[model samples]
Target: MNNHIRLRKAEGKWVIRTDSAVLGETLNAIELTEGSRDPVIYFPREDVAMVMFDKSEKVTACPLKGEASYYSIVGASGTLKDAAWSYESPKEGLEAIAGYLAFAPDCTKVGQY
Candidate 1:
């Protein structure tokens, strides 16, 4: 079966925020919609505050996107566990998201400006 996934470039700056900090802001964000899932905002590694996150041991498998690696965000409040994920090597037709991190909806607030 064909994958029902689409990718697009965001129109303007997009910001990722935690309760105590702004994790990132980028004009080069990628918007991804897959099947019936909510659209996800992806930020390039360079645009994110990578130093605030630590690679986690969790991994999730997706047939279309390949294995996902997770990261836990550390902040003044506390650690948010496995709150972000990235497909370091997207399977195919989804290469635009490679190494791009996307936060869990409840873990961070995604805003556009």
Candidate 2:
């Protein structure tokens, strides 16, 4: 199962996009999280749709994965905080993702799905 994302390198950053949706606009840094999961990328908070995110108090920790910061999707119909997460300081082996965000349940919309 070759599930790697097809990324296009532009300038010095990577534009992460799949066939149906644009995952990220500009990602200068990326690292694979959770083994086979798609690599996560770091983008300025302003890069994402502000209307879709809501700062949440939810947080989790992983001894091997590092600290996880979470946020909720505002106006998502339901209480869906923790829809996005990132590691501010990842473990030694995963230093590439020192500060990157990864989407949970994928970020594609219904039509895109």
Candidate 3:
């Protein structure tokens, strides 16, 4: 049975941007099906626009996913609170996502090309 949300490795280039600027970009991003929860596009931190991200005090955890760190996307126009998140060290099978950050799907535009 197909899950309500399916997660898969990206097949094309995916770039995340705010209304005014790019936040991060990836040739290999993780795509997650959108639903009751937020849609997700995960990108390697190395490719992320680090200068745009300001690490935030917010954090959350999941037994299956591990602890999540937060970041606010600050741009020339404005800031998006908790616009991104990452698992510094995640549970097994999700190690690929380590050191990666996923933008808040509803707010950040992820263009697939």
TM-score of each: 0.96, 0.53, 0.83
lDDT winner between 2 and 3, please give it. 3
Alpha-carbon shift of residue 8 in model 3 (angstroms) = 2.7
Structure candidate 3, residue pairs in collision = none
Q: What C-alpha lDDT does candidate 2 achieve relative to the native structure?
A: 0.55
Write one digit per residue (lDDT tens) for candidate 2, span 5-78: 33322235544333354545553434344456654445544445546567678889887767888877655345
What's model 1's TM-score?
Answer: 0.96
Index of the highest-TM-score prediction = 1
Candidate 1 per-residue lDDT, tens place, 1-113, comes to 77899899987999999888999999999999998888999999999999999999999999888999999999998999999999999997899889999998887999797
Global Cα lDDT for candidate 3: 0.80
lDDT of 3 by residue, 1-113 (tens): 43355568987888888878877668878866545665567898888879878899999997666899999988876888998999899877678788788877667888786
lDDT-superior candidate, 1 or 3: 1
